């Protein structure tokens, strides 16, 4: 039946994973395969050692185990995984305060956790943490310190203290600039990169139409393309035209845009342009 051929299919693969048993010309009998596996394993908290588990959490979501005191905030324990995750040396983290290691604005929340709430009670919070000798919450500033967003989960366990994992959730943090328009072409949002792209400040574009900044030879194309991205529904349509900077120079500019459709009601929320310098 289908059970017995299945087990012989297990046993042969077992012969492959047993070294003393695979390096054979002829596969031995079931009894000898079993015997060989038993001694092989005899020459060697479930499946994984505490070390192995620490390194797996590290590979999986850049997680390190730490313990803090629920009143002082003293780091009473930190995993060495804290070095690959935060680029802190273990000694800088051990004994230091958790409140000194988080971002100045995130201290109130770190203090509303760990305050007095039984034993085995849970904690979970997001808070930023200083990197030292990579950031993940918006465009990196200039020569400022990096703070990574760290996801802390843990329980309360006396000699009162917090046992926690801090792990990174990197797949969340995110020359050109994005803008939004109504269907008529009216700037109703300008990302700040526009200052560096065409010299203007966002409000100096807001409320005006994009075609107004458009070289007169090119305006008819740009009007046409806008009325087109309206008819194209979701799909993207790009056009190159000349854009009058604030230095009064004309810059060649490839803008790809599309109509942003509400995934439920399917109404048009606005038009998302990505305006680029060529």
């Amino acid at each position: 039946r289908r059970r017995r051929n299945k087990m012989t299919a297990y046993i042969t693969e077992l012969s492959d994973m047993v070294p003393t048993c695979s390096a054979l010309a002829r596969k031995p009998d079931k009894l000898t395969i079993l015997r060989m596996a038993v001694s092989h394993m005899k020459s060697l908290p479930s499946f994984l050692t505490d070390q192995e588990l620490k390194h797996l959490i590290l590979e999986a979501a850049d997680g390190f185990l730490f313990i803090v005191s629920c009143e002082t905030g003293r780091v009473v324990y930190v995993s060495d995984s804290v070095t690959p995750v935060l680029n802190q040396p273990q000694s800088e983290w051990f004994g230091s305060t958790l409140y000194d290691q988080v971002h100045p604005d995130d201290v109130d929340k770190l203090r509303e956790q760990l305050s007095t709430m039984c034993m085995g009670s849970r904690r979970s919070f997001i808070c930023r943490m200083r990197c030292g000798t990579r950031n993940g919450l918006g465009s990196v500033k200039e020569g400022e310190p990096h703070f990574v967003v760290v996801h802390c989960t843990g329980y309360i366990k006396a000699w009162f203290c917090l046992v926690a994992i801090g792990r990174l959730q990197v797949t969340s943090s995110p020359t050109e600039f994005i803008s939004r328009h109504n269907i008529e072409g009216i700037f109703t949002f300008v990302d700040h990169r526009c200052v560096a792209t065409v010299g203007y400040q966002p409000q100096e574009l807001l409320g005006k139409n994009i075609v107004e900044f458009c070289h007169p030879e090119d305006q008819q194309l740009l009007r046409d393309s806008f009325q087109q991205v309206v008819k194209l529904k979701g799909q993207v349509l790009s056009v190159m035209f000349r854009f009058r900077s604030k230095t009064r120079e004309w810059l060649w500019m490839r803008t790809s845009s599309f109509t942003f459709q509400n995934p439920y009601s399917d109404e048009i929320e606005y038009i998302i342009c990505t305006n680029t310098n060529v």
Binding site: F47, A61, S124, L206, Y270
Partner: protein, 278 residues
């Protein structure tokens, strides 16, 4: 008659192989022959899998604290998709046995129809998807976050998301199109708007233009699977600037939108949208 003796020696060997598995006595002792061989194989395979990958994997109370410190389960797939490891704590959230899943194909426990997407994520290098998994407590939406290796995934599964709100998180009640129905008056502890000045508008109006597309994709997954977690995104404030949020959302034909507040206001000088004028 000689077959009896041969099978007796085989049985004795199976007993031994069961004793040597890295499981508790009480669990391994109650296994059948077929599963003793399965766990033996995949455990040797697991040894191989941790051998590869950098580093090779490897106060001794550590692993217990790690596992009970996560709010989800930890697992490792091979290039095929068979579980090479899953933490006992899967039983906490899906009620599946670690002993049952180990060695099995993940697809035997993924809702079919999420099969295609899951197959796409393993390649069949960070990963982050939402998937329905078999729960017996008749599926649960599981957020998987992890890494692919170019050949096997290593990741965390978290159930989504009773309702413990804390200080730095505002609840919204939204329509299925993300227009704001109701808002905690607490929002004003972190933002310039009160529930008077938010209800009636669409979240798409408040998402910074660079995150509209990411929030939209999240809205898609929200209507598709019933629960979603956004990335870190920016919510525009009434003066200017924005506050960073991460949000967990579930459907109830209305939408619950729990926003963890991640930062105080940033760049509040420069306005960006129309609604930030005059």
């Amino acid at each position: 008659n000689a077959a009896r003796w041969r099978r007796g020696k085989e049985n004795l060997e199976f007993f031994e192989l069961a004793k040597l598995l890295p499981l508790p006595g009480a669990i391994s002792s109650q296994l059948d022959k077929a599963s003793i061989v399965r766990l033996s194989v995949t455990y040797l395979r697991l040894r191989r899998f941790a051998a590869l990958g950098a580093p090779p994997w490897g106060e001794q109370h550590l692993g217990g604290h790690i596992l009970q410190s996560l709010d989800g389960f930890v697992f490792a797939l091979n290039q095929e998709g068979k579980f090479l490891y899953i933490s006992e704590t899967v039983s906490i959230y899906l009620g599946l046995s670690q002993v049952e899943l180990t060695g099995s194909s993940v697809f035997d426990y993924i809702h079919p129809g999420d099969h295609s997407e899951v197959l796409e994520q393993l390649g069949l290098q960070e990963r982050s998807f939402f998937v329905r998994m078999k729960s017996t407590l008749g599926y649960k939406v599981i957020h998987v976050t992890g890494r692919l290796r170019a050949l096997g995934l290593v990741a965390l599964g978290h159930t989504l998301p009773e309702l413990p709100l804390h200080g730095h998180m505002i609840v919204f009640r939204l329509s299925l199109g993300l227009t704001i129905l109701a808002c905690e008056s607490r929002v004003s502890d972190h933002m310039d708007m009160g529930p008077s000045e938010l209800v009636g508008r669409s979240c798409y109006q408040f998402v910074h233009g660079q995150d509209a597309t990411r929030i939209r994709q999240s809205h898609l997954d929200l209507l598709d699977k019933g629960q979603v977690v956004t990335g870190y995104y920016r919510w525009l404030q009434r003066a200017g600037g924005f506050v960073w949020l991460q949000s967990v959302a579930t459907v109830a034909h209305h939408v619950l939108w729990v926003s963890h507040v991640l930062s105080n206001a940033e760049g509040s000088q420069t306005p960006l949208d129309a609604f930030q004028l005059p």
